[model samples]
Target: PPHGELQYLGQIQHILRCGVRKDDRTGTGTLSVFGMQARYSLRDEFPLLTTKRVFWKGVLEELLWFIKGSTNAKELSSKGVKIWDANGSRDFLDSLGFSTREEGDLGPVYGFQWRHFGAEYRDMESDYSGQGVDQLQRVIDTIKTNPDDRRIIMCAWNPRDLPLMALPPCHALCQFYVVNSELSCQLYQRSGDMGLGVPFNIASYALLTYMIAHITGLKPGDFIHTLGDAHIYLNHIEPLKIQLQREPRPFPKLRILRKVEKIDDFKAEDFQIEGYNPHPTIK
Candidate 1:
């Protein structure tokens, strides 16, 4: 019998059962949990939610862009991924004193930090040479050379670069571990929007883990998601309650058709999600 993604469903149920009620920065209150963790074994199935539809195309597109080392939203929009629209909107850019920003230029957000952490970022077009650490590349190289070394981490949080971003990183840092030739990933998200954003975060990072493992010649291991301030908003409580009653269907499997040597070389047609049958949209 299939386990039916009980790990994910159970975590949300536990939070709903006993989370503290508190006010937040958005003036909307939440049933808040301080710390929680979930683990998904990547060998059998992908961890996308089967209780509600997850816009997976958007998720794949966004991950590809991040691997491309791009902070610009111009290409993402062209691919029909509208998740970054509000963050890269003209009003948002103008508020950040970017009077000359040509649309969709989100400053140094995740990709910049992943590929070029500590680089001096003056808008998106400045030349950054010998100024930053390529954390992703370094992680790949270290895994190939020193598979047993314990410090394989890629972080998106830079205190100095926070002011340059449209929105600060939510899934801030992650560390990779290797054991028995299997590569696993653990993500530390500072905050996760429980209702709308949680599922996408889970699937995206899990996909990232699978991609990195494929590139580095290792089997994909578990994705350990650890959250800092995980909460469900007041407005989302009703829908969430409805969501909890629904049984999880069998999880979908991610199929990567071609052999990709480089992390930056994956495209849309190269990936596919097979046998995903979820319940109706919660929204």
Candidate 2:
């Protein structure tokens, strides 16, 4: 069960205070932290926070950059997306004797595995490269041809390739189920740092689902989040408390600039938002 109910403002504060709680052992706690499930539907509003700035541009660019299978931080930095400043860099990778390069390999990180990781024995190389993994495609195809498939899936986690990944796949795996043609999705997170990362993670994935549903001819859905090691880090306690004291503002509305026909075709320029009024910045 969830320990404390989460509020947008308080969540961010928890992260700012605690940083991201971590440990020496791996595969121990990502599930409890930030996993969520949301099914697509037209009746309910998608969950994007308006209580504070969620860095829409950063999230979009990061998603686009990630989808491109580009593991180098240069693309993101050039776009002014630096949320990874603390943990990502050629220097950081170099410190561990790994090369963060342009051509050879980016280890077994999100881009690599999401697009190309293969269990050769199983004849499965995640084939997202052609037009991106058909996660959204299956959803579209299912809703149109067999709405009862009930096994729509999206995966960001791979335990087999963990040794090759730069970081543990936190937002690892996800599945969407259809009921009476209404979609609801769930994310199995390996970790959630309540303050700094979980909030944006929710917003980004929610936006991703929204985009998928919109282009695929399905409505928005309910999102279910599941986590492994969820915690309020030592530093974020004060900020989290302050945020809990305030009322959560209404969720924001998202507006896409153009229709994204395929996951691979998504670029940073294809998005726009309106009616996004919120409080001042948070540190």
Candidate 3:
């Protein structure tokens, strides 16, 4: 069982209750949502979406792309990363003439930013490239080399890249643990649009820890997820209510196909899903 209550949407409702709407350059309004969590667990629930139209396919692909560390929006778009639907007004994409579409397609913002931040000024010099911040790989390396480093931290929030982002990063920062080469990862999402994103976040990073474990000579022990401003959008509330009315069914377990020895070596074919039986797809 999870240590405490599985808080679904406390932070988000609070934000809408207390926040003032702010209009930005694009005329889109935003209410600053704040969410914070001291700790959470992943074993009790895998965090798969039980709500409306959760794009499980896109979530997995996007996370895989992030692990690969590519900057090409076109590539991620091909893989169905819809997170950048508003990128037209964002700094980097806008400067490059990237505009929003009717279907709302935005390219590989987070994956690129995390993996290959090309030409970004770090100490006013060329980017660190391969060494540029990688949350996944950092945890992997820590388990193998220095598992006891109390500061095994990874942060997704970057002040330099904020202006170019169509939206802020949710899983902003995290830390993990290593005990006798057993790995446990914890995430801190500053803003979680729970209706749209939390379920995916859970599945994504949980799989992430599993993948990293395969390569780093570590065992995937636990997953900890903490949220800052977690909420379901007003638009998603009714659907969530419907879901709540329904009893949750048993979840199916997944098996990695090849059991590859390397994190980087794990391919798309390596995963096989089983046992997940939901009530019915929410329309």
Candidate-wise lDDT, in order: 0.84, 0.57, 0.58
Count clashing residue pairs per candidate: 0, 48, 7
The TM-score between candidate 2 and the true structure equals: 0.75
lDDT of 1 by residue, 123-164 (tens): 665666556899989999999898887999999998898876
Best by TM-score: 1
Give the TM-score of each candidate: 0.94, 0.75, 0.73
Query: Among these predicted structures, which one has the highest lDDT?
Result: 1
For model 3, the stretches where C-alpha displacement exceeds 4 angstroms are 1-45, 50-53, 80-92, 95-109, 116-136
Which portions of model 2 show Cα errors greater than 4 Å? 1-44, 85-88, 99-106, 119-144, 281-283
Residues 1-283, model 3: lDDT tens digits: 4322234433444555665554444565555455455333434334453333345566667767666654444546666564543343355555655443212223334564555444362331223556555555656666677779888876656666765444567777767787766677888887666556676777777777767766775766667778765544555555655665554444445567786875666666777655555567653
